[PDB]
Design a protein around this ligand. Structure first.
Ligand SMILES: N=C(N)N[C@H]1CC[C@H](CNC(=O)[C@H](CCCCN)NC(=O)[C@H](CCCCN)NC(=O)Cc2ccc(Cl)c(Cl)c2)CC1
Ligand SMILES: [Cl-]
Ligand code: NI
Length: 212
């Protein structure tokens, strides 16, 4: 009795893999996050929820990495990905635009989200306090739709904004890979994949999307 267009599927553990393929490249670029949630280059070509005695069970919330699923006219597809950590579900905002989510017997409703920062979480406040150390290599737990989950490793570059510096990864995945977690050597999630810029030489770069 707990049904939505969208649901999530636990698909992998949150881990640092050692046999992980090295890749990407470390760029510095000057950017600015507008109030829509789009990063812009130098000359380019949020609210809480009230969420009371609900008519359905609460969702699953087992820790781990997840696929976000939904169906279109031609049947199912992966809308995005996310991480379940300390009982909350974390993803980019553009993945579900706040849509409710089925997880097992129950259902997860959004808690907090910011359109500007493109972040969203379900069933409690943002749990991911860990954050890029500024200099070490990271791993993306790439939850590409249709593919097996793999870790890829990259040395992040940086987005140079007026608000300050942010790590950025030069990795290019399909739109359903948004909300894939990025971990550090200790297996902490230091951010999420999927909001970034397309460079003028054509390369896509994602910010390590994260809190504050
Ligand atoms: N573009 C390449 N080469 N690769 C993938 C593109 C889709 C993206 C998923 N992210 C996204 O769709 C987010 C949505 C941001 C909304 C903010 N709240 N877009 C982005 O991170 C960038 C930056 C926006 C333009 C610069 N001002 N947009 C894009 O990359 C545009 C785009 C190109 C192709 C597709 Cl299929 C799609 Cl769906 C979108 C993963 C990388
Ligand atoms: Cl785990
Ligand atoms: Ni060091």
């Amino acid at each position: 009795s707990h049904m939505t267009d969208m649901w999530i599927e636990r698909t992998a553990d949150i881990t640092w893999e050692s046999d992980a393929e090295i890749t990407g490249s470390s760029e510095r670029v000057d950017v600015r996050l507008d109030d829509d949630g789009n990063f812009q280059l130098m000359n380019d070509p949020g609210v809480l929820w009230d969420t009371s005695p609900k008519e359905y069970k609460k969702g699953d919330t087992t820790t781990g990495v997840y696929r976000i699923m939904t169906r279109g006219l031609l049947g199912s597809y992966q809308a995005g990905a996310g991480v379940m950590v300390e009982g909350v579900f974390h993803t980019l905002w553009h993945t579900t635009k706040g849509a409710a989510l089925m997880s097992g017997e129950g259902r997860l409703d959004p808690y907090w989200g910011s359109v500007k920062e493109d972040r969203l979480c379900y069933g409690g406040p943002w749990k991911l306090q860990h954050k890029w150390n500024g200099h070490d290599e990271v791993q993306m737990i790439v939850v590409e739709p249709g593919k097996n989950v793999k870790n890829v490793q990259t040395k992040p570059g940086v987005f140079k904004t007026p608000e300050g510096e942010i790590g950025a990864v030069t990795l290019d995945y399909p739109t359903g890979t948004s909300g894939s977690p990025i971990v550090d050597k200790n297996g902490d999630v230091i951010g999420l994949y999927g909001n970034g810029v397309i460079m003028p030489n054509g390369s896509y770069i994602s910010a390590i999307v994260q809190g504050e």
